[PDB]
Design an enzyme around this catalytic site. Structure first.
Site, PDB file in Angstrom:
ATOM      1  N   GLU A   1       0.777  -1.242   0.000  1.00  0.00           N
ATOM      2  CA  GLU A   1       0.000   0.000   0.000  1.00  0.00           C
ATOM      3  C   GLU A   1       0.810   1.294   0.000  1.00  0.00           C
ATOM      4  OE1 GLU A   1      -0.125  -2.579   2.076  1.00  0.00           O
ATOM      5  OE2 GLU A   1      -0.955  -2.043   4.027  1.00  0.00           O
ATOM      6  N   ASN A   2       2.002   1.261   0.556  1.00  0.00           N
ATOM      7  CA  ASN A   2       2.813   2.454   0.577  1.00  0.00           C
ATOM      8  C   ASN A   2       3.352   2.780  -0.817  1.00  0.00           C
ATOM      9  OD1 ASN A   2       4.218  -0.048   1.200  1.00  0.00           O
ATOM     10  ND2 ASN A   2       6.087   1.188   1.486  1.00  0.00           N
TER      11      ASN A   2
END
Ligand SMILES: [Cl-]
Lengths: 470, 467
Positions: B292-293
């Site tokens: 997700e980052n």
């Protein structure tokens, strides 16, 4: 990502009636091989989400000519006589969509955002509805566009626009590695990038398939996760619509060009419309730095290419082959319009057929005589933060007013123009104070302006004779 | 772009009470220098929009230690004791914001979009309101989040999230060319890219200024038009929160979880068991892990020489990527997740309801670190959501039950549950179906460790275990 060797194999399963996102801006970034294949499959009745209509014998135009398209969702469709025949004849459905809105709805379509709000089209037919989608021979509208919901946010009016998501996306890209990572070349990216994230099945044709590792991971325009089918295009004609090459108007126009040239400031980010505005950029002091933004996804437009610089992948919004200056950047169409709607461009200067006392603009449509779409114009005037400057001949033939209390022609935007430059006068425009004559062409009197302007104006106590760039 | 040589100079005009967007994912991509400058200006009562608050003595944590932040708008507190301390004490106000939503709202902030709909948070305290924003010194709530409007589009419910625009944006980037164009490195991009277009004044700190022409026009992540002020960072400590290098009933869960992977699959593995299950993937199988980052193609923990403070996984651990990986901004990452482009989302849970509700982010008065990206990860129906967890809690309290008692992460979003005793398929309407059962255990065994009724698969097999 699945790889194919044959364009037809990759698109053979496109259904009749499919909504297909077709990349490209003008003839740039067009998936000509996937279009060629759809020509061979003969898939019919498509809803082509495509920024433009290519031309008569290329891009979307080829599918229009073989009549494989039932509906266009585009922002600008000029330069295609067969398109115009079909549209005017009532054989083609066309949703004239603000380019920026088109880009953003496509993006939302791949980002799981069902709808979002935008200032673009507020106070125009996009928001109001009534834009012709399907005509009848007679000239009357058969299918009218529906209004978009309006909603207030932080004191301003926005309209709700919904995501666009295709069954297939025919994406022209530059290269793909064997993993399925894709990159686009120069202004050829335009809609290809966001379209590649917004269809059930994305089909990408590339000029070259390259090894994994060919790309820096940070510089993969479209991550393999978005690339379902990949094929290496067999033939690339890369037609050039308007060859504009440089080698190493009348006084009325000359005068407007020369006053508009005075709007440019150093370090300014400006977007310039076709015609006079672009020409005025020609009078920018070499000492001044003005960064020209092209909605087709470019920041840093340069002069027309020399013969050896001609590149079908690099054209301005006017679809002319261009060049970019040093430090320029390319970005997708959705980013370009995020940059524009977000008010990041300092000055937008464009032509107009009409301007109203308080800033309304009319420059995209002439009911029945000019219906080629609004391109990026509604997006360009959508931000309060961008200074919008109109450049136009003061009056129409027979001295009919172009500057009036309200425009009679379809609006590109409301209270969005901050200044008007004509060959006779320069007016500041304020959504509250109205029109203020701040410059008057020598020889003419305030009274001469009054009889060639259809609304009253304050006369600034600092009113000066009209300036001309030296 | 206006270039500054001194960071204080670049931010001395931030007023007290200013809303400031601060880039960074954990300690990756944080604007150390700009944050240090704020320590000097002493500007207080700040509303800082930042994914995390760094750690206790670094990143945004510093401004928390100095009580210069009146309010954090973040997705996850993580291992920041003081951040958590302050929040629970009623000193610091916090709007726990779903990471993906945090990102899209910032982007909207620079894109002329005042508001947009997203499915993330629907059915949770984000949509409902009540998320504690500010606590009373005595444990109760002083300020609760307000509810977000819900709207249905094409058969599904979404909530209205408004643009986040900051007065200032303190952005960390890798390089800037002399024109003002900026690029990011690996996963340090995260929130820096979008925050750079959503503030009245963006202040970008780079580790390097290169020549105009150093970038290929197609590869400039942040065009100069968005960089108002640019300063080269004075000091970069390259701090790494977690150094994960490399040279049993929990194992039953892992070995079964490993069988969820298929060839060509794009997956997001939650912390713990899920991430662990990826170790059992067959080399003959290609599985792409999305972080997700902002990463696609996560690899194993790095060897010592592979360690890079700009490349960490969602659990804030140092990681690597495999060939053909890509990096992209946090808003892109979540456009990817929210868009259902990830095939498999596998994560842990404290509770799972009969129909797929998941509770994995909050426990009133004890677990208040926020939701991170979890609400976003289970927001797409197109993505397969598999929960891996111990069948029961201490004292054999049920975890699989009719209705979760803990704050929800997502409503009817779990597709399958793998525990050490069973595997159930979960349907948003029919409920649970025991499809696999650990040998030596009976359906009765399952019955007494499950708070609710489940169907038994007519083709129930002994629980499989990756080899
Ligand atoms: Cl996090």
């Amino acid at each position: 990502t699945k790889f194919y060797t044959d364009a037809v194999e990759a698109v053979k399963d496109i259904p009749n009636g499919a909504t297909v996102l077709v990349g490209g801006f003008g003839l740039s970034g067009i998936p000509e091989n996937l279009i060629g294949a759809l020509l061979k499959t003969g898939v019919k009745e498509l809803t082509a989400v495509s920024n433009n209509a290519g031309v008569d014998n290329f891009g979307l135009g080829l599918l229009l000519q073989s009549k494989q398209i039932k509906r266009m969702i585009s922002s600008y469709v000029g330069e295609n006589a067969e398109f115009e025949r079909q549209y005017l004849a009532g054989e083609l459905e066309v949703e004239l969509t603000p380019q920026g809105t088109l880009a953003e709805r496509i993006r939302a379509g791949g980002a799981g955002v069902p709808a979002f709000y935008t200032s673009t089209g507020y106070g125009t037919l996009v928001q109001e509805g009534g834009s012709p989608i399907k005509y009848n021979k007679d000239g009357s509208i058969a299918i009218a566009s529906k209004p978009r919901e309006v909603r207030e946010f932080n004191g301003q009016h926005f309209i709700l626009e919904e995501a666009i998501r295709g069954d297939f996306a025919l994406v022209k890209a530059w290269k793909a590695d064997q993993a399925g990572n894709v990159t686009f070349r120069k202004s050829a990216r335009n809609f290809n990038l966001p379209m590649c994230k917004a269809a059930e099945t994305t089909v990408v044709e590339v000029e070259e398939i390259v090894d994994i590792g060919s790309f820096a991971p940070e510089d993969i325009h479209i991550p393999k996760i978005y690339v379902h089918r990949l094929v290496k295009g067999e033939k690339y004609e890369k037609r050039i619509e308007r060859l504009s090459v440089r080698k190493e108007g009348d006084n009325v126009r000359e005068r407007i060009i020369k006053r508009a040239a005075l709007e440019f400031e150093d370090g300014m980010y400006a977007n310039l419309g076709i015609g006079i505005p672009l020409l005025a950029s020609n009078f920018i002091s070499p000492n001044m730095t003005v960064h020209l933004q092209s909605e087709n996804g470019i920041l840093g437009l340069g002069p027309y290419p020399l013969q050896n610089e001609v590149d079908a992948d690099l054209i301005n919004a006017g679809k002319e082959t261009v060049t970019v200056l040093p430090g320029a950047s390319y970005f997708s169409s959705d980013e370009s319009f995020a940059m524009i709607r977000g008010g990041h461009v300092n000055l937008t200067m464009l032509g107009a057929m009409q301007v109203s006392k308080y800033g309304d603009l009319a420059n995209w449509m002439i009911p029945g005589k000019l219906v080629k779409g609004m391109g990026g114009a509604m997006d360009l005037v959508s931000s309060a933060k961008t200074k919008v400057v109109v450049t136009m001949e003061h009056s129409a033939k027979g001295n009919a007013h172009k500057i009036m209390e309200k425009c009679t022609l379809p609006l590109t935007g409301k209270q969005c123009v901050n200044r008007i430059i004509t060959e006779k006068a320069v007016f500041d425009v304020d959504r509250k104070k109205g029109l203020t004559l701040i410059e008057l062409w020598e020889g003419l009197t305030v009274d001469d302006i009054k009889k060639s302007t259809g609304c009253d104006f304050a006369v600034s106590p600092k009113l000066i004779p009209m300036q001309q760039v030296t």
